[PDB]
Amino acid sequence: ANTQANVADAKSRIVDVDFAKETSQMTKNQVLQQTGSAMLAQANQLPQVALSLL
Amino acid sequence: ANTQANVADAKSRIVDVDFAKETSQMTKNQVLQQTGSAMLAQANQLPQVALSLL
Amino acid sequence: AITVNTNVTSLKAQKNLNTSASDLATSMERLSSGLRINSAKDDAAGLAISNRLNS
Amino acid sequence: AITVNTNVTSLKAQKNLNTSASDLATSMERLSSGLRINSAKDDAAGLAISNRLNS
């Protein structure tokens, strides 16, 4: 029983996820998605300077 | 853990962008693009004084 | 600065929360067992003194 | 004047916003830790007095 407890602890250190870290990464990538979407939508409007010159 | 936090702070000071500054630069260059487009379109109409003299 | 790629306040909050959770788990174990010394992590000289008194 | 190449109101607004963000981060850290003195940036003489009282 002792050894089972210690070995399950050891395995958990390797296999399981950390919620405190992974939620932070998720929120960071959410914000980056919104920023990149805005920036790409603004980037697709660059060829319209030619209509002004034309 | 302490040292990782402090070193990631140090790296962020060097690598990451400042949104408050960069959005301001973006808006300034937007306005300058519109002004320069207008001024170039007005500049291409200068050889038409000759037709008046002619 | 206003940055998106690195968040240091979150790192420090994570470390504090982990420290608190570890302390709580230790206390829970000690109340469940009824003993102050469950390993040699706790008190090493007291472990040997208590082994001799137990004998 | 009406100018496009330099914007000073934006510079001053940036500095105020940065000051506010720094203060908020400091407060968040202090509430997460439970301590007023997390470094010697905070109170240097109190740090040493408290080390001696801790001993």
Return d(Cα A17, Cα C50) in angstroms, integer.
40
Q: Where are the alpha helices (DSSP H) in C1-55?
A: 8-33, 44-54
What single-letter amino acid sits at A17?
A: V
Experimental method: cryo-EM
Q: Rounded to whole angstroms, what are the CA distances from A51 to A41, B27, C49, D2, D16?
A: 19, 21, 91, 27, 40
Within 8 A of A24 by CB-CB distance, chain C residues are 7, 10, 14
Q: Which two tokens stand for residue B27?
A: 């808006």
Residue keyed to tokens 């937007």? B30
The Cα of B5 is separated from the nearest Cα of chain C by a number of Å equal to 6
d(CA A3, CA A22): 30
CB A49 within 8 A of CB B33: yes
Return the structure tokens found at D9. Answer: 């109101």
**CB distance B16–C5 less than 8 Å?**
yes
For residues D36 and D42, the answer to whether their CB atoms sit within 8 Å is yes
**Candidates C7, C13, C18; nearest CB to A28:** C7
Are C39 and A2 in contact, with CB atoms under 8 Å apart? no
Q: Which amino acid is at D21?
A: A
Closest by Cα among B35, B2, C4 to A34: C4
Question: To the nearest whole angstrom, how far is the Cα of B51 from the nearest Cα of chain D?
Answer: 36
On whether any CB of chain B is under 8 Å from the CB of D32, the answer is no
Cβ contact D–A (≥3 pairs, < 8 Å): no
Q: Of B28, B26, B27, B4, which Cα lies nearest the Cα of B17?
A: B26
